[PDB]
Amino acid sequence: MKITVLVGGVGGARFLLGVQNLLGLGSFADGPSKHELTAVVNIGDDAWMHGVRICPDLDTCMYTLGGGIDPDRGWGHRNETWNAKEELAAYGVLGDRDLATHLVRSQMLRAGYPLSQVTEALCKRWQPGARLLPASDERSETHVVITDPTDGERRAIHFQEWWVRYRAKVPTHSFAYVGADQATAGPGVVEAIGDADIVLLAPSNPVVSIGPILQIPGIRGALRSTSAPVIGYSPIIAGKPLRGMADECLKVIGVESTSQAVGEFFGARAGTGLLDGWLVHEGDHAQIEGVKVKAVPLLMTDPEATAAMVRAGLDLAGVS
């Protein structure tokens, strides 16, 4: 009755919604449920900005599961304004509702509360119906090393600045996980991975959403050691118009945007890797030595479809 999912980004929040729907948790609860959902949430995008601490993935899971996301925009609060952002532009340097979260979190961190407890405190308001554990209570911020065009020097940029400003506009060389080597697995993270009935890798971006969770010392070891089946979900959805575009962050590490490539990225637990099973969308193929591969529908069209997706993860692992 214990399921733990590693997540990052909007897609992670959507996958958790499916988990909740299948198991009657959170918004989808009819009576008190038989299951506990634990999310090990990416902190690689977290940043100090404008004197306040911003944790996008933890916030996106919290708001999404708490039913606070705007149905028509898909991101951000309902009836959001960006007046504070507007004045910040005028000052020459982030919704208003979003800022309140930031002020509260910042006040807690500066008063000594670790992020895990900041998160629990915010979740008393949102009541996501899930345990959202930050991968780490220490800093571990995903950066991108570019060739800077002012002087030609390699520089590390915060992933967030890279994504808006520099992506596809200057040469990019690698990712750096700033602070990761000095970070420890956040409270409960190794325990949540060790005691689970099943561990699911959400179909988030493998490099910058699941990937940085894996750079936290202790987390990768937990995954290799745990007796819970580990089932990963492919993030590659073929069949789009013009056959889609390759993933920009997989490009940075020279990894093809195929279910086969992302699968080899995580690799087989039978070997040095992390996966016992690997789900791909129907019509897609992957053969990976040691890894059970199955094509099923993998579109998170709504919680009902994601619930089917989660159900197929249990079945491949053989978990009830």
Added chain:
Amino acid sequence: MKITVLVGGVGGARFLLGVQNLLGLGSFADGPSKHELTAVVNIGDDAWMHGVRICPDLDTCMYTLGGGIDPDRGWGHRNETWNAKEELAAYGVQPDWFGLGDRDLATHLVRSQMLRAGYPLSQVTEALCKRWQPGARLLPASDERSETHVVITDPTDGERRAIHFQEWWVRYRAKVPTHSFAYVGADQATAGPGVVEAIGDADIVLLAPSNPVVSIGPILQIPGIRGALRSTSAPVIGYSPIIAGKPLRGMADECLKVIGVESTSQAVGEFFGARAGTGLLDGWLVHEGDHAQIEGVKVKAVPLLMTDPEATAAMVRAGLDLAGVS
């Protein structure tokens, strides 16, 4: 050439506007500027709230002179929204009694981040003023902390408590029994950069008709500042903030009562005193129809309503004239 004015918030900014219109400064600039206006701004109301630093007096002048102030509120931005404040309420956090506007919050965020990175307030203020272009030099009385505290009888328990000015003013609206003010940090605060010099090199120094106990007073509590006023060669002209028989914006009467000073122009004048003896004033202007005696102080009844920048401009002229300054 050089005018230095001690100011609070809404009233100091309003008086400062009069200075600007009289001299063709800031928003009122019509051709080459012949004058330099320096404001020494009260920092006694400054407070940390929700993890961000609030400087209401500096902000209100900054917003007012820069054409951003809320016309009917007198504090905070025009067309302000309060969604961020609303969300703080929804999270159930404290204090829920202090209005952090969404537009206003950006100032607080930029200011808080710069101070935390070691920038002194004076530099934060100049930086913020590059966007607003107030047309005046807004000097914090000090780059160090000097916050007015209020000794009340707390209505929860009947106990004596000290509260920050913000809680006295915003939460209780000065309606709790009030016993004294403490200028916590003033004796340890150094006069801000340029403040003593602006007082010394001024052709004239003007005390805006701001709140005497909680707006001008706390400036005068910074050790360096009071000496500059006494030791300066520029005449010091004060404006009574009390228009006897006419209630005015703010709680000046309540603040005067705490320090046991009658709400009359003569009493406020004597509060500040005469430079001939132990005081600070050379001159002291009051509203027409008001009589005031101050030994050592030239007192002149003149119109004293800040109804508009043109009317205030005349008020400024009457100080120059009483000082004998051109």
